[PDB]
């Protein structure tokens, strides 16, 4: 659209240079100086947003928020119908049974907690089932679903008899106090991609052997997996309590958001030191290019116009090298396992993920460009004082 290009003088000074001269050498040292900082900085930025990618998708996207309990013990379903449970933010209800149990077999021991459901309803939290049918959950055979990682340390495959025991929620015998021993066979295993221990078993709600057949409470799901503080002190009926929430899992939702604010805002001194290499690159062109300033001072050049030549030339050197750090940052996007060979230290688990965000490019290119406009002031002022009488004719 025929833009008024007034930066044509500074673009030719940084393009038409030789290779054997010493002025082209220091410009390369500066270019690879910013590229080191920007790239090593976007590598930390990629692995910090990768922790947000791994969380709330398959690690923190299957945990519940709040459960319903009572004070008199269990809950009678015929007095609390489905038309009376109306809360703010809830969308689905399901009965559930609680109680801490312990595994008492002839091989090893394990501690876990059951999860009572019905074959008519399906849980929307953990749909990852390794050939587990939600319909085949009849309580007449006393079946249970065992996790994959709990069955590996126990060494029991599907189709075997495993005895369970509960210390607390057993049969309240009027004469004594006996432990509830129930034969809960495993006919199928499942894996829910749990980096947590994950010792949850799946039982049926029709089990009149734990306590008193009634249930303990209902499930209250919520479509806000980040915070529950906006819907905590709401209207609640009589006979309901408040339980724990997302405050005890991995990283506590604190070690990523605080570290990103410390690396993005407080750690902005990388480009402040890297701007001094631009002053070295723009400070050597007043010695090998003394004659061109003498030509641009005698034919009617104002002192205001000569300040706008080295400022754009100092900003043109800050663009190249900073965009190379964004180009090398995209090179590590497809690097998942090949970038880290075996030098002994491996650190298995969820150590180094990758996540490229498009909104993190403008925040890292604006700080690397605006700090070069205020830095190029001392080489821009000392070149205007060079009169064409003592240096060159």
């Amino acid at each position: 659209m025929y833009q008024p290009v007034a930066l044509f003088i500074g673009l030719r000074y940084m393009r038409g240079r030789a290779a054997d001269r010493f002025g082209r050498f220091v410009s390369w040292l500066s270019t690879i100086g910013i590229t080191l900082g920007v790239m090593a900085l976007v590598t930390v930025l990629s692995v910090m947003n990768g922790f947000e990618r791994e969380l709330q998708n398959n690690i923190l996207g299957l945990m519940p928020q709040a459960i319903l309990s009572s004070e008199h013990g269990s809950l009678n379903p015929q007095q609390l119908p489905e038309t009376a449970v109306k809360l703010d933010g809830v969308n689905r209800v399901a009965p559930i049974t609680t109680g801490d149990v312990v595994l008492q077999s002839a091989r090893s021991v394990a501690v876990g907690v059951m999860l009572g459901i019905d074959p008519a309803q399906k849980d929307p939290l953990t749909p990852y089932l390794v050939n587990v049918k939600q319909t085949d959950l009849e309580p007449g055979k006393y079946n249970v679903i065992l996790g994959e990682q709990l069955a590996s340390q126990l060494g029991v495959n599907r189709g075997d008899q495993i005895r369970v025991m509960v210390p607390s929620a057993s049969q309240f015998t009027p004469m004594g106090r006996i432990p509830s021993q129930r034969l809960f066979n495993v006919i199928g295993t499942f894996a829910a991609n749990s980096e947590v221990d994950g010792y949850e078993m799946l039982v049926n709600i029709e089990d009149a052997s734990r306590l008193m057949g009634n249930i303990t409470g209902w499930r209250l799901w919520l479509d806000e997996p980040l915070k529950v503080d906006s819907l905590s002190q709401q209207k609640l009926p009589e006979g309901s309590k408040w339980q724990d929430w997302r405050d005890r899992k991995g990283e506590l939702f604190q070690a990523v958001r605080m570290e990103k604010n410390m690396m993005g805002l407080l750690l902005s001194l990388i480009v402040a030191v890297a701007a001094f290499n631009i002053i070295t690159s723009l400070g050597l062109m007043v010695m090998e290019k003394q004659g061109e300033v003498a030509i641009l001072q005698t034919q009617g050049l104002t002192p205001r116009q000569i300040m706008m030549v080295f400022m754009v030339q100092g900003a043109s050197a800050g663009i190249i090298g900073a965009i190379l750090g964004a180009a090398l940052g995209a090179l590590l996007a497809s690097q998942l396992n090949n970038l880290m060979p075996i030098i002994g230290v491996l650190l298995d688990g969820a150590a180094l993920p990758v996540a490229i965000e498009p909104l993190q490019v403008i925040v890292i290119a604006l700080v690397a460009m605006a700090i070069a406009l205020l830095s190029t002031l001392y080489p821009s002022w000392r070149a205007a004082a060079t009169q064409p009488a003592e240096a060159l004719r």
Binding site: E292, T298, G300, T302, P303, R304, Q387, P388, R393
Partner: protein, 221 residues
């Protein structure tokens, strides 16, 4: 009539940490349609004299005038308006821009004044063809010969159509065949509009120009 009036420009500064008497009491007067060809020597301060008349340094002894505009009233930004419009500067110390092309170098004084881009390109084309260099317009001055890039610097000061062209020895860096041809290009400017040119001389190569040859050896007539 009168363009520049030198009134005792004694340049007294630390020329190499010593006070020299090379530029002492220089005072002459150039006309408008006519001019002056100062015959000097190598070391008398011919290049030093044209720097003081153009407005590059201050002598702190006297003051000159330019059609009723003295240099005491001209600031640093006001001298840039005088050097760009009505002052031509021809030099001889390889004063070209090798980064730009030969077309942009002639158009460079017009690019400072920020005129219409149609009249910048057309004025540089007719000035390059006056010295016979329109076929080398889009060419770098680094690959040009010595008898070709010198004529670009001569045509670099005639695009603004000045009144006093302080030429610092334009003849001597090129051959004998093109020395006579560029004498008419300075002579045709007297016929169209009357552009004066104060040329310095130390090998007596401007002896046949006019009658006014003042021998100012070390500022002494």
């Amino acid at each position: 009539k009168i363009l520049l009036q030198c009134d005792n420009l004694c340049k007294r500064y630390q020329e190499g940490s010593v006070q020299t008497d090379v530029l002492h009491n220089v005072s002459f007067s150039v006309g408008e349609g006519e001019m002056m060809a100062i015959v000097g020597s190598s070391g008398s301060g011919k290049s030093t004299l044209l720097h003081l008349l153009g407005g590059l340094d201050t002598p702190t002894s006297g003051d000159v005038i330019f059609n009723g505009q003295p240099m005491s009233k001209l600031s640093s930004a006001a001298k840039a308006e005088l050097r760009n419009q009505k002052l031509g500067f021809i030099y001889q110390f390889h004063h070209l821009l090798p980064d730009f092309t030969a077309l942009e170098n002639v158009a460079m004084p017009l690019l400072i004044g920020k005129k219409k881009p149609a009249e910048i390109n057309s004025r540089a084309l007719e000035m390059l063809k006056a010295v016979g260099l329109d076929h080398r317009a889009n060419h770098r001055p680094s690959e040009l010969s010595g008898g070709e890039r010198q004529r670009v610097a001569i045509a670099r000061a005639l695009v603004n159509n000045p009144r006093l062209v302080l030429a610092d020895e334009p003849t001597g860096n090129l051959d004998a065949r093109n020395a006579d041809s560029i004498f008419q290009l300075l002579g045709e400017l007297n016929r169209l509009q009357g552009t004066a040119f104060l040329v310095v001389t130390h090998d007596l190569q401007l002896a046949k120009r006019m009658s006014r040859q003042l021998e100012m050896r070390d500022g002494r007539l």
